[PDB]
A paper describes a structure:
These multicopper enzymes catalyze the one-electron oxidation of various aromatic compounds, coupled with the full reduction of molecular oxygen to water. The electrons from the substrate are transferred via the His–Cys–His pathway to the TNC, which is formed of one T2 copper ion and two T3 copper ions (T3α and T3β).
The triple mutant Met199Gly/Arg240His/Asp268Asn was obtained in order to further study the functional role of Asn261 and Asp268. However, functional studies revealed significant changes in the oxidative activity of the triple mutant. The extended pH activity profile (from 7.5 to 8.5) of 2,6-DMP oxidation was detected. Moreover, the rate of 2,6-DMP oxidation by the triple mutant form at pH = 7.5–8.5 was almost the same. The expanded pH activity profile for the triple mutant may confirm Asn261 and Asp268’s involvement in the process of proton transfer to the TNC copper ions. However, the absence of a manifest shift in pHopt can be explained by His240 being a stronger proton donor at pH 8.5 than Asn261 at lower pH values. The combination of Met199Gly substitutions with Arg240His (involved in proton transfer via the T2 channel of SgfSL) increases the efficiency of 2,6-DMP oxidation by 16-fold compared with SgfSLwt. That was not the case with the triple mutant Met199Gly/Arg240His/Asp268Asn, where the Asp268Asn substitution doubled the efficiency of 2,6-DMP oxidation compared with Met199Gly/Arg240His and increased it more than 30-fold compared with SgfSLwt. The efficiency of 2,6-DMP oxidation (kcat/KM) by the triple mutant form Met199Gly/Arg240His/Asp268Asn at pH 8.5 is about 34 s−1 mM−1, which makes it one of the most active laccases in alkaline conditions.
Numbering used by the authors:
A (entry chain B): 41 to 317
B (entry chain A): 40 to 317
C (entry chain C): 41 to 315
Amino acid sequence: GAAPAGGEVRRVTMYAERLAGGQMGYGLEKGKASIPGPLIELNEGDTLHVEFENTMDVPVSLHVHGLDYEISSDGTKQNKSHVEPGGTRTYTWRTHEPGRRADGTWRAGSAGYWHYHDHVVGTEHGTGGIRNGLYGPVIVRRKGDVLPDATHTIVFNDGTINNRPAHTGPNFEATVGDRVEIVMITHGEYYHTFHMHGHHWADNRTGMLTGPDDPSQVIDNKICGPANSFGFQIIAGEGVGAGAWMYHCHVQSHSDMGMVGLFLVKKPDGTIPGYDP
Amino acid sequence: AGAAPAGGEVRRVTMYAERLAGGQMGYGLEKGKASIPGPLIELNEGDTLHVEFENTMDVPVSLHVHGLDYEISSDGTKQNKSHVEPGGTRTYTWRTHEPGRRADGTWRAGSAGYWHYHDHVVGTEHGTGGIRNGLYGPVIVRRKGDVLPDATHTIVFNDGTINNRPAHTGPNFEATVGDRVEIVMITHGEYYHTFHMHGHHWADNRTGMLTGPDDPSQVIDNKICGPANSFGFQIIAGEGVGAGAWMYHCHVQSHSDMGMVGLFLVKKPDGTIPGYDP
Amino acid sequence: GAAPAGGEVRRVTMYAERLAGGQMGYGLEKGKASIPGPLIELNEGDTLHVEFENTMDVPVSLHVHGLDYEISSDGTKQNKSHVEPGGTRTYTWRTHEPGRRADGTWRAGSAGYWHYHDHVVGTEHGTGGIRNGLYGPVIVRRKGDVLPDATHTIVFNDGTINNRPAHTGPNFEATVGDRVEIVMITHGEYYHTFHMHGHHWADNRTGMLTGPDDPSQVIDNKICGPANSFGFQIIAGEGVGAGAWMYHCHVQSHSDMGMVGLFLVKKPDGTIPGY
Ligand SMILES: [Cu+2]
Ligand SMILES: [Cu+2]
Ligand SMILES: [Cu+2]
Ligand SMILES: [Cu+2]
Ligand SMILES: [Cu+2]
Ligand SMILES: [Cu+2]
Ligand SMILES: [Cu+2]
Ligand SMILES: [Cu+2]
Ligand SMILES: [Cu+2]
Ligand SMILES: [Cu+2]
Ligand SMILES: [Cu+2]
Ligand SMILES: [Cu+2]
C-alpha cells in the first residue's frame, strides 16, 4: 500500500553482541544479533526509543544518520553517550514531516534512507566496531510513499558485502513483478560503484521519478564512499524478464575479488531461466 | 539542430570485435574499422536495436549494455551463457521504452539517457581485460523533444588514460563559438576521477541542461565519477566566455600531471583562437 | 535577509604571499593572506575585477570555477595568463542571471558554491600551489536567495582540513537558531565523504528544498573529490538543540588521523551542554 502519516511513539529493545570471528552485531532480541543489524522502519513524525544493552566487554555506541536526536543520543564518547560494558541506555530518535517555516522557507522532512552504526569501538570514530559489523539500515517513509513487497539491505564494508567472505553474495530472490526495495550503505575505507544488471532507478529520494516533470538522472550505477546511504525501489524484471541478474561493485578488481551477488528474479512458476546452480 | 522524434523503429546494425595494435581490442561497425571508444549508438525511446555481432578474435568476447532493456539472453556474461566464442556470431537485442503511468498509479521512467556498452568476458568474467583493452562505447537514448546537438564527442577515463590514448595526447575537440556541443562522459577501471572543463558548466541532471526556472538541479563544472558511471550534457561553446583553447582534464592532481588533459578548441566565426599556441 | 538582483561592477586587490612552512596563500591586503583564501561574494550579474599581485619568488595564477571569464583570465601558463614574480594582472570574472536563450532552452545562472585556486605552482596544473594553500571560496547568489548569519568554509585538501595539522579542527561557533552557511571544497589526490552530526541538508544548489516539489535527496553525508565544491544552509540545532556537534570526513582512517572538527551550538545563555 502507501505509508500513513506518522507521529506514533515506538519502543524497541536492541542489543550489541559479540558474534563469531571477532565480529560484532546489533540485534532486537538477545542472542539474535546480525550483520547488517535489524532494519528499522519509521513514518515521518514517529519517535523511537531504543532501550539498548551492551552485552560486550568493550564500550559501544548507537549513532544514527539523518534523524533528529539530541546530543545525549549522539552515541559518542566526546559527549558521554556511549554504553559501558554491561550497561543499558535509552537512545531516542525523532523525525519530522516537512513544512513551511515562519521565515517563509521550506523545512525538509526526515524522510529517507539512513543508517545507524557504532562510534566508539576501536577508535573515537568506531573504526573497529564498524569493521566488525556494528551497522544497520533505518528507513523513514513519507506519507504516500509506495510500500515494497520486500526490502533487502546491501552494505559495502571495506572489501566485503555484509561482512561475508568474498564470493558469497548475498543473493536475493523475487518474482517478476515484485516491488523490491534496496537499501545501499557503504562503510570503511574505500569508494565503490554499485551496479545492477537489467535494472535501473532514479537518483533521488525514492529511486522513482515523482512524475514527468522530475529531472533526476535515471541510472544503473552509482559512486559512493563511507557513510553514504541511499535506496530505491524496482519492479523485478520490468522490461527484462526473469533471470539471475548480477549485482556488483563495478570497480573491476572488486568484482573479480568477490563483491558480487545475484538478484534471482524468478518466473511465476519459481524457476529462473538459464540459471544453473 | 532540431529535436529527437518519437521512437518505435526496429533498427539493426552489424558490430565486430577486433584486435588492434598493442593488444588493444575495439568495437567496429565495419571490419578493420574498430575504434576506441567504439561507435556511438543513438536510439529514440521506443526503438528496438538488433546488434548482429561478430567476434573476429581468437578469444571469447561479449557485449553488455547499461540502462537499456534486455532479456537475460542479451546479458553478455559467461554466467548467463550469452558471450561470443572466437570467430562466432550472435544477435544482441536492446529494447527501449518511453515513460508512462503504471497501473499501480506510479510513474515508470523511460529508457532515455547517456549510457554505454563494454565487454564482460575478456580477461576475467567481468570484462576486466576487455575493458582495459578498449572494448567500450557510448549509447545515447533520447526522449521525444530532446534538443539535438551540432556535434557529439565521447570522453572515456579508462584507468589512467583517456580513450586508451597515450598520456598528453588529448584527444582535442574543435567547435565554433555558439555550437551546441554534446559531451558523453564514461568512466572505467579501478580509479575514481573528477572531470572538469574550463570556461563551461552544466546542470547535474539527465540532459545537462535545466528544464526551466523551476529545476533545482545543481549547476557544476566538476564531477566525481567512478567505473561504469556515465553521464552526458550539452553546452553552448564559448557561452559568455568566448573563443580560446579551453582545457578539459581530470582534476585529481596527479592524474592531470600524468597527462589526462585535452583541449576544447573553440574558434570565432572567422576561425581564430585567441592566444592558442601548441 | 534576501540577496538582491545583481549587476554591479566590483573591484578587489588580491595578493599571493608565502606563509610559514613552505605554505602559500591569497589575501585581500598585503601581509593578510589566509588559508583558505578570502571569501568573495557576488550576486548574479555582478562583474568583479581582481587586481592580482604576485609577491612571491615564483610564478602563480588565479583560476576560477563556474564563473564567466574570458580566455585571457583563464589563469594558466598555457594561455600566458599567469603572473610572474613581482608582477600584477587584472583577472575579470563575470556572472549571469538565468533566462531563456533564443534557441528556446533554459540557460542556468551563475549562482552556486564555487572556488578559485592556483594553476601554475609546482606543475602546470597548480599541484604544488594547491598543496601549499592557494585556494579560496566564491559564493554567487541568485535574487531572492536567503542570506545567512554566518558563512564557514571547510576545505578537504588531501589529508587535512584547511592545511591545518591533524586533530586541530577548525571549530565553528553558532547559537541555537542561527542560520549557518557551510562551503565545502575538496582538493588534492583523495576522495572524501563529508558528514555533520545532528544536521542535514538538501543535495541541490542552495542546500534547501525549494518547496514540496523539490525531489532532491536529503542527506547528511556526501562523497566528493578534488575540485568539487558545494554548500548549504542549516538552522543550527534545528530539531536537535545545543551541543558540540562533530563534523568530519567519514572515511575511517581520515577521521581517525584527524580530519575532524566541532560545530559548537550554544544555548542562548552561552553554554554548550556536554562540552
Ligand atoms: Cu561521527
Ligand atoms: Cu568496490
Ligand atoms: Cu551491467
Ligand atoms: Cu557516520
Ligand atoms: Cu557486470
Ligand atoms: Cu582521474
Ligand atoms: Cu578550472
Ligand atoms: Cu558494466
Ligand atoms: Cu585546470
Ligand atoms: Cu577524507
Ligand atoms: Cu553522524
Ligand atoms: Cu580547477
